[PDB]
A paper describes a structure:
Here we show that a dominant member of the human microbiota, Bacteroides ovatus, contains a GH115 enzyme, BoAgu115A, which displays glucuronoxylan α-(4-O-methyl)-glucuronidase activity. The enzyme is significantly more active against substrates in which the xylose decorated with GlcA/MeGlcA is flanked by one or more xylose residues. The crystal structure of BoAgu115A revealed a four-domain protein in which the active site, comprising a pocket that abuts a cleft-like structure, is housed in the second domain that adopts a TIM barrel-fold. The third domain, a five-helical bundle, and the C-terminal β-sandwich domain make inter-chain contacts leading to protein dimerization.
The crystal structure of the native BoAgu115A was solved by extending the phase information from an initial selenomethionine SAD at 3.0 Å to a native resolution of 2.65 Å, whereas the ligand structure of the enzyme was determined by molecular replacement at a resolution of 2.14 Å. Inspection of the surface of the BoAgu115A protomers revealed a cleft-like structure in the (β/α)8 domain that extends over the central β-barrel, on the opposite surface to the N-terminal domain. The center of the cleft, which may accommodate the xylan backbone, abuts onto a deep pocket that likely comprises the active site. The Oδ-2 of Asp-332 in the apo structure (the amino acid is not visible in the structure of the BoAgu115A-GlcA complex, discussed in detail below), is in an appropriate position to make polar contacts with O2 of GlcA, whereas Oδ-1 of Asp-206 forms a polar contact with O1 and may therefore act as the catalytic acid. Based on mutagenesis data the other carboxylate amino acids in the vicinity of the active site, Asp-332 and Glu-375, are candidate catalytic residues; the D332A and E375A mutations caused complete inactivation of the enzyme and a ∼5000-fold reduction in activity, respectively. It is evident, however, that the distance between Asp-332 and Glu-375 (in the apo structure) and the O1 of GlcA (in the structure of BoAgu115A in complex with GlcA); 5.4 Å and 11.8 Å, respectively, are greater than the normal ∼3.5 Å between the catalytic base and the anomeric carbon of the glycone sugar in inverting glycoside hydrolases. In enzymes and non-catalytic binding proteins that interact with glucuronic acid, arginines are often important specificity determinates, making bidentate hydrogen bonds/salt bridges with the carboxylate group. It is possible that in BoAgu115A Arg-328 contributes to substrate binding by also interacting with the carboxylate of the glucuronic acid substrate, a view supported by the observation that the R328A mutation caused ∼105-fold decrease in activity. Arg-328 (and Glu-375) in the apo structure, however, are too distant from the hub of the active site to play a direct role in enzyme function. Thus, for the arginine to contribute to substrate binding the loop containing this amino acid (and Asp-332) would be required to undergo a conformational change.
Numbering used by the authors:
A (entry chain B): 32 to 330, 340 to 381, 384 to 853
B (entry chain A): 33 to 854
């Protein structure tokens, strides 16, 4: 299926040789659609080789590219002379055959020859040649650059994508304010989508091998905003439709814009105007391949069957042809689905719908499977509705989309697949997976699934970047699948179990890995990578840290712990950084080409809809007078252990001329506590910790971690006592053996001081307090002792380099 | 702070819109001051873009004047007023910077720097440069000089006072392979010539130090190039030698002539040694150099065997006699040092003493902790005390040659101590190859100057001022946060000592520390890409690389630990972790390759080539960085099923892929969908166009024998009632007991009762959780088998949680429980 090589070879056609492209010939009996594709091919080749190939007016070159459509007299007298059999394109749908051939017609020696089964086959073939040459369908829509080549050669043999398994394959631009609309404003100057915009949309669709579009309908009217809209799609080869709730080829806004004049949307009071409304739409779309939405809602099963009948009679009257000859779609959404369980005319495409969240609701049984008109599926990657919007980023696991669409195809649904793509961006990858599956759902299985994004990343970022990029794409997709950014908040994950820490840290790890890849990019890929990997990863990693930080702020605040203050700072930074990321995306990235494409509000949802005016700061509490909020900690032992950071003491008594001092960051974990200054004696000085232990425990082992200070004042060493109030003390010398004497030097000395701490264990007795509360007092007996951590082991301590996670506390 | 970058009245014009102003040094000044001024000239050039003139005589309107207290010219400036002699007379290494009107004949107004001695004057000149934007680290760390249109000098008198420590210096040590091979590449010499030593010296004086122990592993400072001493001496730097290099001879001077000489044994070869000693003192005449007395044993070792206090006394008594013979003066007039390093401390303990005048150099443990400090009586020892501090070390229990590993807090907490106990004559820090200890050096030198500038409360303002100076005000706070934290992390354990067993794997501590460093990396990359391009090189040198190299090194070892744990269980997931080791190994090389070859244009090739992966013992005596041992499961795709879970903490969380046994229905397969769901993957019977009748999937677990009842949570993909109005059903149960059926999606539709209470809430989250209570059968095994049976097509099973009292509502349904397979 790969027919382009970038190095010369025998019995291969020199399309581009040593920087010189052969010309292009399109016979003039070819639809305007082919001439466009061919003009784009011409520019695509200019992109790859540097020199513009000439669009021939006649058969005036020895080697060239020819592209044509089956059924032409010219193509017939080429297929005939010769070799290419008729059966291979006769009555085939949207197929092409691409084949190097001598000697195609008199004035020519040899040519690469693309022949379509119909115009879209021919267009699809042209773009295949263009894509295998390195022009990604996303060269404009995602700034993917064109890998330059001095030599392009085409393999011998016959090359096809066959027939598309799904008859109509398209996208729906929807939920398009404010992002898409304000982008279109910035780019085109228009308060609607005009033909310049839709040319861009149609080309993407076609280059993706797609063939269908539901144009934007929230505030615009495709048919009525610009006479050239229809003319543009129809001449290029894109079939227009309208959404399930816009019957008879009228755009919903055509009615709304004139609500006051036309009156109610109700068939039992305003039938005549509505019939005329329907009628004018069917007239407007004559001579396009457009598909017609039937049915009606709002403002009995009998009433509806009668609307359809009338709609069909209106179709018959305008077309002067039986209804069955106008493509029609009827949607099974809401009540109309219940009704179905209802007389539906044989020829109509019956359109099923997903649950708005990527899971299919209902599929046809074997009896329904043989409904002549076929079945369609309406699938979502964006959504405005319950339980909360998903308007912001891509939230679709590659696996989900895959799993539900192979199911859909397998249950016979193969007439029409339409994907709600929001603002188009940032759904570039899921769009592509949708089109490729729509072409052939049986080209995929569990084994090879991830090859598709691998190809995608190879195509978007060069082969050397493909694997790493694909890994990041697949993961970020999966992470975003867990919870949308709109429904993410401080409660989504479990703080207590370290779940929230694990998912925050993991997303930041991915951010790290995406930045590695990003700075390793040849600069002409930086934009496409930011758009398709870097930004979604950065934006959501940052969001996750924000709510993580919000969660920590609340837990800590309720614990009267002033560490809440730092977590508040963090919330504010992430909130700032969120706006910072999108400003880069709108104004800086790609020269600000995509201004307004990333302005969707997502922080401040207290509801299903984005009712709130702007992105707003998530509630944070600050502890007043942190400097003075020290001491008072009480720990609650759990899982057989109490890990305590020196600083979280209950009460403390200093020696005269000393102040117990917090040395932040000191040691392996939180901080160090030390009597200061070091010149004064430590007599009478103590520091205490309040804990709850299960009652009955009478003997515990306590680990005391101190900075590995050496015997600097006195050859004996440093000593301290550790003990329970109401129990016997133990006095420990921790550094007497820590010196260069032969029996200490490599046995105990250096192995200790390299690792900067001294840990000693004490087997202490615990008094029988009736409420389980205990107080452990530590007394430094010599100067310059820095206490870092205590661990009360009562059966659960597990030897850990940082001496286990700090236990539950409050002040 | 006296330098502003915008004009104003009553201020002094130093740079007007790209125009500097001349400098004038009276030719009566030490050559070292001409050198400093020489550099100031080049600094201004860098600041605006035009080089100021070095005036022959006092002949200008607006110029800089620098000088030293005592010259006839200076006295005839200070009297021209209004400056008191007391301010500088008898003062040590102090300066006065005061704009003065009508300073002498020919000069209208001039910025005047007057030092109390030559070094004073120099530090004054370098204070001007530093304040103008010339960072001491402008060459040594590629720190840009912020371009300035205008530059002006506030009025009033300015000083740093006298320094609190007399001698403040560095020891270049453990200098191979990095420093050595870099010097080669840079200077073209296989030894340190005066050109290398000029750069070293300049840095020291700019940092406000004054002392140096030169590299001595394979070089000989004094012999290699006759200009070495002359440069240091003439620039203002005082030279000394290490604790095993007595009497002004570099140890290699002995090694090079070892056969010719005798053997480093004073009791049997006194004559040849006495002469060696003598030649050193002869040679350092005319210099401020400090002389090492005492004697260890021929390298980093003891003379000899065990403490011999009587003998070393003769060594000393004799050395001091040589000093007088050479100097024809009393010994007490030649600066001397006795260093109590390693074993030499038992000497002082066994009671050895030296004359009142020698500097008693006390020592840290080679790892940042001070060994001893004077008591009350001892602090009264007239020669004074000193401290030999380490930020790099070759020796026990393993080398630390690679990266900065000193937490900011440690250096500070130990040095505030040292100072409080009146150790205030000499501080020297072992800096390894100088790079990458740029930070700790500066903290050392700044503390050295003025230790009571620092307290626990404002400590962190020092690396802040550091980062501002190096990266620009707007990146200070963040850069400082990263500097502090990375220093701290590295304190936990050295690169050399870190290995797969450092952290606890089972508890998730390993995971924790690995993620935290990549978080840090992530944060530093952010800051990096946000920088104006002139700072990129510095920031890489000072922050980025230390962080990346280490974060990567932590991940390599974490992956190793995960690889072995998983390989033990026969879990093919071990292959992924294996790939991850090889990948981070390669990345370690890529990072140092960049540092050596790409960054700063390759200015620092070989400064970052230390071996750090593959230490078996204390020393780096192994061929090269070598890949940690990893294990692979052969035939991974066939290594499925067989899993047995063991409960803990009152739960068993099973990822669905990890089954014990399965049986498919006719013309279906049980199929793994990697990444499917919230966690690991999903199991589904495929294709979905077949009935699931007779299909099942089983899990083998170990509960405590006395658990009668459990609640199992079954998590499937939120598949909807697509085929059958009744919806989808499965059953879950123990072999030996009854199956329990569950209909998971009947309530998931648009009916009024369901639509907004349960339907949309559930589907937007892509999963369905249902719980069943189960009776635990009594088994002979103590083991139970729990069987899931899909009853409708298209059910994807994601996870199971067997809960016997420990389960905690979690979005990901808790970290998977402990397993092994076969
Ligand atoms: Na959007
Ligand atoms: Na080194």
């Amino acid at each position: 299926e790969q027919f382009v090589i970038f190095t010369p070879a025998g019995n291969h056609f020199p399309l581009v040789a040593n920087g010189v492209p052969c010309p292009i010939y399109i016979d003039s009996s070819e639809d305007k659609g082919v001439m466009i594709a061919a003009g784009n091919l011409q520019q695509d080749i200019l992109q790859v080789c540097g020199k513009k190939p000439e669009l021939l007016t006649s058969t005036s070159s020895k080697r060239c590219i020819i592209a044509g459509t089956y059924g032409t007299p010219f193509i017939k007298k080429l297929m005939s002379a010769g070799k290419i059999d008729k059966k291979e394109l006769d009555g085939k749908n949207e197929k092409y055959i691409l084949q190097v051939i001598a000697n195609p017609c008199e004035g020519i020696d040899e040519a690469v020859v693309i022949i379509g089964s119909d115009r879209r086959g021919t267009i699809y073939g042209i773009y295949e040649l263009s894509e295998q040459m390195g022009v990604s369908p996303w060269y404009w829509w995602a700034d993917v650059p064109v890998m330059k080549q001095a030599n392009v050669y085409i393999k011998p043999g016959q090359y096809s994508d066959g027939e598309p398994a799904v008859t109509y394959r398209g996208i729906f631009l929807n939920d398009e304010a404010p992002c898409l609309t304000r982008w279109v404003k910035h780019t085109y100057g228009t308060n609607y989508g005009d033909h310049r915009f839709y040319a861009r949309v149609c080309e993407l669709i076609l280059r993706l091998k797609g063939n269908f579009l539901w144009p934007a309908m929230w505030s615009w009217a495709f048919y009525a905003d610009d006479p050239q809209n229809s003319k543009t799609a129809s001449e290029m080869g894109v079939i227009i439709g309208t959404s399930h709730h816009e019957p008879m080829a009228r755009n919903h806004q055509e009615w709304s814009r004139k609500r006051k004049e036309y009156g109610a949307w109700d068939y039992t009071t305003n039938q005549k105007v509505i019939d005329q409304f329907f009628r004018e739409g069917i007239e407007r779309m004559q001579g396009t391949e457009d598909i017609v939405t039937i049915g009606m809602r709002g403002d009995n099963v009998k009433l509806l069957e009668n609307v359809v009948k009338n709609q069909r009679k209106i179709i018959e009257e305008v077309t002067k042809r039986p209804a069955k000859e106008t493509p029609q779609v009827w949607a099974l959404y809401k009540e109309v689905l219940d009704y179905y369980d209802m007389r539906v005319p044989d020829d109509v495409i019956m359109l099923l719908c997903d649950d708005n969240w990527g899971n299919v609701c209902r599929l046809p049984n074997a009896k329904e499977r043989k409904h002549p008109g076929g079945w369609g599926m309406y699938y979502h990657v964006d959504y405005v509705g319950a339980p909360r919007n998903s308007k912001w980023l891509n939230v679709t696991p590659i696996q989900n989309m895959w799993e539900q669409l192979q199911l859909t195809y397998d249950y016979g649904v193969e007439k029409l697949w339409i994907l709600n793509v929001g603002d188009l961006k940032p759904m570039e990858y899921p769009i592509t997976l949708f089109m490729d599956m729509a072409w052939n759902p049986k080209q995929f299985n569990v084994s090879n699934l991830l090859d598709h994004p691998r190809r995608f990343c190879a195509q978007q970022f060069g082969e050397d970047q493909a694997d790493e990029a694909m890994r990041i794409l697949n993961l970020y997709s999966k992470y975003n699948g867990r919870v949308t950014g709109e429904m993410l908040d401080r409660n989504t994950y479990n703080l207590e179990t370290g779940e929230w820490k694990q998912v925050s840290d993991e997303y930041l790890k991915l951010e790290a890995e995406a930045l590695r890849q990003y700075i390793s990019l040849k600069p002409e890929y930086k934009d496409a990578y930011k758009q398709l990997i870097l930004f979604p990863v950065q934006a959501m990693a940052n969001l996750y840290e924000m709510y993580y930080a919000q969660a920590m702020n609340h837990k800590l605040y309720k614990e009267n712990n002033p560490q809440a203050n730092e977590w508040a700072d963090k919330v504010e930074q992430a909130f700032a950084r969120d706006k910072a990321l999108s400003d880069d995306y709108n104004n800086i990235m790609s020269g600000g080409k995509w201004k307004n494409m990333m302005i969707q509000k997502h922080i401040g949802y207290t509801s299903w809809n984005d009712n709130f005016p702007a992105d707003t700061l998530p509630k944070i509490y600050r502890i007043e007078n942190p400097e003075k909020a020290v001491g008072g900690y009480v720990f609650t032992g759990q899982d057989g252990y109490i890990a305590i950071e020196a600083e979280h003491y209950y009460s403390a008594k200093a020696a005269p001329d000393t102040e117990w001092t917090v040395i932040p960051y000191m040691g392996r974990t939180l901080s160090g506590m030390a009597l200061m200054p070091y010149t004064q004696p430590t007599d009478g000085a103590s520091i205490s910790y309040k804990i709850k232990l299960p009652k009955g425990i009478d003997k515990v082992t306590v680990h005391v971690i101190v900075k590995s200070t050496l015997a600097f004042h006195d050859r004996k060493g440093h000593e301290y006592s550790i003990g329970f109030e109401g129990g016997k003390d133990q006095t420990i010398n921790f550094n007497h053996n820590l010196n260069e004497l032969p029996e200490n030097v490599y046995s105990i000395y250096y192995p200790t001081v390299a690792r900067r701490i001294v840990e000693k264990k004490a087997k202490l007795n615990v008094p029988n307090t009736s409420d389980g509360m205990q107080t452990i007092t530590f007394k430094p007996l010599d100067p310059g002792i820095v206490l870092e951590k205590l661990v009360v082991d009562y059966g659960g301590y597990k030897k850990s380099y940082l001496f286990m996670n700090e236990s539950k506390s409050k002040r």
